[PDB]
Amino acid sequence: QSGEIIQNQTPRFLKSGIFQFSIPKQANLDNTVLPPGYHWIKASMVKPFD
Amino acid sequence: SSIDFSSSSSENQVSLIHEMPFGFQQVFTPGDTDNSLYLVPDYCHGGELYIGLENGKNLQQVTLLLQFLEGSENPDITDIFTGNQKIKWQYLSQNQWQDFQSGEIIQNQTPRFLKSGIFQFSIPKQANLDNTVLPPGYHWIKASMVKPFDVVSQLINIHAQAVEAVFEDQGSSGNHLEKGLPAETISKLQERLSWIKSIQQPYPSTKGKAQESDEDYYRRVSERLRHKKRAITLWDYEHLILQKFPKVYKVKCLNHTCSSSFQSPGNATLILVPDTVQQSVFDIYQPRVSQGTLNDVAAFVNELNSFHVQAKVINPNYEEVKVDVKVKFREGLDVSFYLTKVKEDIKKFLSPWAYDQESSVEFGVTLHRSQMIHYLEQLTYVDYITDLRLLKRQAGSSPCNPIFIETTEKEYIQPSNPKSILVS
Amino acid sequence: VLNKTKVGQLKSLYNEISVEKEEIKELNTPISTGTFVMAPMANSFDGLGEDFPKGSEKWWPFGYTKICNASTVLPALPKARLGCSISSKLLKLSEGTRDIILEFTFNKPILPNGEDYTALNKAMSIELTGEKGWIAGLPMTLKSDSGINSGSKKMKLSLTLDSEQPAVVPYQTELHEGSYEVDEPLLRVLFKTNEKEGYN
Amino acid sequence: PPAAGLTAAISGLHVGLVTDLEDPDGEDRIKVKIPIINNEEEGVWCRQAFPDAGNERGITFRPEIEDEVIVGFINEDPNDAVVLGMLHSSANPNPIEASNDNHEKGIQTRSGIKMIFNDEKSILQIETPTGNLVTLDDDAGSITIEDQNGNKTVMDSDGITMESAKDMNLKASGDINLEGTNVNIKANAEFKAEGSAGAEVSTSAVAVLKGSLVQIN
Amino acid sequence: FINEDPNDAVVLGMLHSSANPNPIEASNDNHEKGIQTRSGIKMIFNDEKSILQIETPTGNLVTLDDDAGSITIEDQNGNKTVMDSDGITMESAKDMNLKASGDINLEGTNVNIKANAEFKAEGSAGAEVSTSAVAVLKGSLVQIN
Amino acid sequence: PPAAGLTAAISGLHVGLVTDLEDPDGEDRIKVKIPIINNEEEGVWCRQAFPDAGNERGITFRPEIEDEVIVGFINEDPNDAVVLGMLHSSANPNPIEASNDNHEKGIQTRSGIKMIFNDEKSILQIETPTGNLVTLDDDAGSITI
């Protein structure tokens, strides 16, 4: 949500920098699609890998 | 098997138990007789609040602080504890409720749950920790009312072991006096004693006042020389109250207003708006004045009006429209100057009219030109193509058919009273 | 004087009545006659433990019965749990086809309009203590010979268990999850206070 | 100069009282009052010495709130205090009575769990407050294990005895083998024996089957 | 230091610090006390629950528990003995051998012996099965001598 | 001034010998000689420090008559002596042989009752002088009584 990302200095992964966010309420440690015990965050792209 | 519950000399071999909202009770055991049994518990009309206490003893005193949010009650009820009516108290013993005796209540500063205060009592002998109608291990105390649920104020909390204390005036500068001491500034005694594990300060301090400044001295003297301490016209009423009552932010005098009329001679209505700066307590989107102030204000002025005129003092009963707009042409960043941040700033600007807060704009109740200037001044903005602020006709919570503010108004209040034009 | 007495728990109830009892002629009245609700945790947001949202902590000392109020919208409170239970040896039933009949007699007549078994099934719910916990649901529907005659002082209830059902057993605190001082089987009946028939 | 010349020094050892066991800065310190300085305020944070300590190991016991302790000072500085041990007095009696024979030694906790060594009789006894105990006794030549419910196992000069308060269940995933000179099985109600792959009773001398009625297949 | 002489030093005790943490977490309730060595062998006293537990690093333990009313002895191989309110239970991971140089005497209200494969009983000087009520011998085939 | 100016003070720590364990005035004191003052007379009553002590609880061991102990002094006053611990020497050897590997730790009493912790092999053994023992051994995977 809009209040959960504080800053993103690396919007297109081209330069070094800081990403900052809060852990959202309802984040879940007990899942099955990815190993349990961790909070999980996903980044995604639909462009060629390079 | 066949059982006559009233007959002696009969093998009444059945056990009967009643199920209750928070527990149960054994009613009839095998071998018993009775004359009056029911299948169900008897709950009469009204409301009940149960307080369970831990680790007391049967002859100790208990002091309780009830912290209310003053003014948060329904103003439109006619059954309001007239005469000598009040809230009743009882304690639990052997699954029965019993009245307190005259020597068991020490004081009650909150007889009708309208204002914050102390309740102090001793734990009665025969108080019981082992019960079934309510969970065991606690002493239980009951409060009750037979009136609609909103005739009392909403609560914030209840605390045991409360102690009252006061600022000592010494040769220093009482800067904290205009706006009181903030919550949680106090944690220790002057000499830290060994037996005290700890001290807490949940709410802001209250009732203090700093010495007059030169600016206030001149202001006060100058007005008395004009109004002569009489409440005759509009200015007189509005300035007499702001000088007399220090925790009123805005005032409005209504020349011919009665609850059912805006053209009745021989009367007047006054509307009071509090500051509510300490938002840790107050609901800043529904600020209200408590009964204490509403009544004190009425008494003060009615003595100064005229033999023939009584004034009424009410809450504004706020209602208001809200803005929507074209996206900003610029922002510092999608996060740093997120539309949500802009929304928060807009809410603060309007909130400052509804309740005390800072705002550069003269008023919330203004044309879009004022709103545009307020936004243009931001260090993270460039332009916006369009904006509007009609009343929320689509507000489902407050019933539909609600009036809208579409007809080119500069955010005019919906009404002379029962309106604010300060949504936030 | 300071000591260790602490506030441990806060609970609340409310019973609001609109219609005088003398006007109840049948269970399915055209108008609601009253409302009963409870809060197991009076000082929580929904009455059950949900945290108050950051902006404000406020609660009603004696609950509430309407969802939309002067300025906001609150979650509904659960309705009050009311009922009773019966315990006796005749319920020790382990196999075969089981048919259980209960008859109830009072000092006064019950109603000017008697009631069908389909009316009673909208007003009450019945459970038994069995081998794997409480026996509940469809197997505990009242049968067609139950009911209340119009001028009578007697109410009749009727239940049956298939040969495929678990045995009915004496109450055990470690199995039936409670705290009753009962050494026999239990039959528990609760009123469906959510419905007009149950409340009436 | 004493305490590096930076503060008044404190000489010798002093006696203090424990007021707080939870250290706000994680150094495992305890807060102690020193009555010859001030017996009313909270006190200062002191380090505690243990008979054995290291990285995630050691022998750990801590004083209770209001226990009396003996305190030393590093470089005689009043704010480098170290707790060296705990003291007894008539206000806080020693659970083991003094004697010049010195026969009894051991550990006794707050809840009543004991572990006692008796030298005179060569006895080691471990026991909880409601009767669960294990005893090694050289003056009996035996080992006893006993619980609070009446179950008991004893190994002594007469062999091994086991008794149960209610029932007894012996199970194995493999074979069960019993041996002895004379095997005697008795029941006060019923005796049964089964085998899914057969059963056999045999002897080199005389087999006997008796009852008030004997049935075969 | 004896007589404040730098070469008459005496060690009085060992210290803990954040660089060398105390294995038992501090609390004003002070419920847990005990011994823990380098290799992980523990002996812990729990006052709140009146429990004494002795345990090695790979599961060999003895526990005395007043909050259960029981005594448990258990090894790392799955063998276990428990004394509690239901009597005495013994279980073996693999097998069980009971031997005596003298007599073996079993008693109880009801004695029940079961085997999932075979049951045998022998005596070099004879054997006997008896009862005051009814003796029963059954099988798909019964052979006598 | 030292020892409040009321008496000659005694600095540092000193070594003494135990002569009497029965305190005539009930304060749980022990009588100790200090050889650098006088090694022939009876000595003075000293308080004893313990690793754990409180109201009817603690870990209690007392020195034997003629054991050697280390003594401190409150406010450097010769008659406020406190016993801080016991010492070993070649005249009174330590039952567990020293090694830089430090594998063996434990308790051994006067009569020969032992409780020994072996870290190298993860073994806990409790044993009395005439063969009664309980052993927990992770190098065998077994429990023996």
Numbering used by the authors:
A (entry chain I): 701 to 750
B (entry chain H): 601 to 1024
C (entry chain H): 201 to 400
D (entry chain q): 365 to 581
E (entry chain r): 437 to 581
F (entry chain s): 365 to 509
According to the publication:
The spike is located below the tube initiator complex and comprises three intertwined copies of Alg8. The N-terminal part of Alg8 forms a gp27-like domain and functions as a 3-to-6-fold symmetry adaptor. The gp27-like domain is followed by the mid β-barrel domain and C-terminal gp5-C-like domain, which are homologous to T4 gp5. Intriguingly, the gp5-C-like and mid β-barrel domains in Alg8 twist an additional 120° around the central axis and are much longer when superposing the gp27-like domains against homologues in PVC/AFP. We identified this density by structural modelling unambiguously as a trimer of the uncharacterized protein Alg6, hereafter referred to as the ‘plug’. The Alg6 N terminus extends along the inner surface of the Alg8 gp27-like domain, then folds back and forms the C-terminal α-helix.
CISs are macromolecular injection devices with an overall structure that is homologous to the contractile tails of bacteriophages. Their conserved modules include an inner tube, a contractile sheath and a baseplate complex. Here we performed structural and mechanistic studies on a clade Ib CIS gene cluster in the marine bacterium Algoriphagus machipongonensis PR1.
